[PDB]
């Protein structure tokens, strides 16, 4: 039941594809939510081009987090 | 420990498979999980953000899954009646030995029911002990049977009182109807104990949906005296008494939880450490021999009747409505499937 977790972590990226899907994501985990999800996903085994697209999307989510809960 | 991490941790618990829950259900109710974790952390003044592995295991592998299971049992209980059809209280019986988190569990379980809008009432079997004079008279009938001198073994329980108390609890289906919870004081008469005076008892109003019923002896069944006589001669009377316990408790408990321990001797261990912690901190602490006598007197019943639970199960139990929690030496749920 590991691909329940891999599916959870990729489907977590689909869950963040909207700007109006942030609010309850972004109380905890942090601005680095999808970055750490990508860490766990690389460790689970993922391709490099998916890694590049993710490493872009997670940075975008970090900016969209700092935009509302930054200093 | 971020939300995602906790998810993973929750999914690796030994009870996720056993309460019927799934990774999707965990993902869909992770908000409920984390709010329950917050509430339990405050209930123990824990930190959430500074939890060691034992605390995390209790909260997210032990307490919350059991709360989820119990609330599902009440859900399926109340789904069986119609509008204006009054709902009888659901009595969930906890069959676990002494000092195995059994007591603090129900304290945690009861608390979450209060938070989530189900009035909760807790009754230990020990609250139905024979009063001090009745206990003394029970002793006098068996002057040569030590196990009946003091409390806990079969006989020390005021069964007519237990039956009336359990019957009166059930009629809390409307508001206004009440019932006093009989509290038992364990320190009366030098530490022997007597029932708390009935004018000091907590009282529950309204319709109560869940009742939490704990005891070291719940689920124990009448055995053939041949298993009994060889484990201890002083159990044969205690065996014959529990035949009359089949009918005052097992009728009334619908859902069950059986904390199952690895080796009964743990009880002694678990007792001593506690008292040792008291004696180390310089507090009223039973002596080593005192604790040894105390535990070694309930041990004759454990070795007789614990085997039956693991083999068959509790007596007035339905197999789909019994949860088994195997705890390790640290009172934590074992991943024994």
Curated annotation (Swiss-Prot), chain A:
Disulfide bond sites: none
Subcellular locations according to the entry: Secreted; Host nucleus, Host nucleolus; Host nucleus; Host cytoplasm
Stretches assigned to coiled coil: none
Induction: Expression is induced during host plant infection.
Notes concerning its domains: The RxLR-dEER motif acts to carry the protein into the host cell cytoplasm through binding to cell surface phosphatidylinositol-3-phosphate.
Purpose: Secreted effector that does not produce a statistically significant enhancement of P.infestans colonization of Nicotiana benthamiana leaves.
Family recorded in the similarity comment: Belongs to the RxLR effector family.
Name under which the protein is recorded: RxLR effector protein Avr-vnt11
The organism of origin for this protein: Phytophthora infestans (strain T30-4) (Potato late blight agent)
Location of this fragment in the whole protein: 77 to 147 of 153
């Amino acid at each position: 039941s590991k691909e329940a977790t891999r599916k959870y972590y990729l489907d977590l990226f689909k869950r963040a594809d909207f700007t109006a899907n942030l609010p309850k994501l972004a109380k905890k985990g942090g601005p680095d939510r999808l970055n750490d999800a990508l860490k766990k996903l690389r460790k689970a085994g993922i391709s490099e081009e998916k890694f590049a697209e993710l490493k872009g999307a997670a940075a975008k989510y970090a900016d969209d987090w700092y935009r509302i809960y930054g200093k | 420990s971020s939300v995602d991490d906790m998810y993973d941790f929750i999914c690796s618990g030994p009870l996720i498979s056993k309460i019927g829950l799934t990774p999707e259900k965990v993902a869909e109710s992770i908000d409920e999980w984390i709010e329950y974790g917050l509430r339990l952390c405050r209930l123990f003044q824990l930190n959430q953000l500074s939890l060691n592995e034992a605390q995390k295991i209790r909260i997210y592998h032990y307490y919350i899954p059991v709360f989820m299971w119990c609330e599902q049992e009440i859900s399926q209980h109340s789904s069986k009646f119609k509008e204006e059809e009054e709902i009888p209280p659901l009595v969930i019986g906890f069959s676990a030995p002494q000092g195995c988190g059994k007591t603090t569990l129900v304290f945690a379980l009861e608390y979450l029911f209060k938070i989530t809008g189900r009035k909760a009432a807790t009754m230990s079997i020990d609250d139905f002990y024979l009063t001090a004079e009745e206990q003394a008279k029970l002793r006098d009938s068996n002057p040569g049977n030590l196990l009946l001198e003091f409390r806990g073994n079969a006989g020390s329980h005021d069964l007519p009182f237990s039956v009336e108390t359990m019957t009166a609890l059930s009629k809390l289906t409307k508001e206004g109807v009440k019932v006093k919870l009989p509290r038992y004081d364990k320190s009366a008469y030098s530490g022997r104990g007597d029932r708390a005076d009935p004018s000091e008892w907590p009282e529950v109003e309204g319709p109560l949906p869940v009742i939490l019923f704990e005891g070291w002896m719940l689920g124990f069944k009448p055995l053939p005296p041949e298993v009994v006589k060889a484990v201890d001669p002083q159990l044969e009377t205690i065996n014959k008494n529990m035949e009359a316990y089949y009918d005052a408790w097992h009728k009334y408990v619908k859902s069950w939880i059986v904390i199952k321990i690895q080796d009964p001797s743990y009880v002694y261990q678990w007792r001593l450490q506690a008292e040792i912690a008291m004696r180390a901190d310089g507090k009223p602490g039973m002596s080593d021999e005192e604790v040894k006598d105390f535990v070694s007197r309930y041990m004759p019943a454990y070795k007789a009747y614990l085997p039956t639970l693991y083999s068959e199960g509790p007596s007035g139990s339905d197999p789909k409505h019994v949860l088994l929690i195997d705890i390790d030496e640290g009172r934590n749920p074992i991943l024994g499937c």
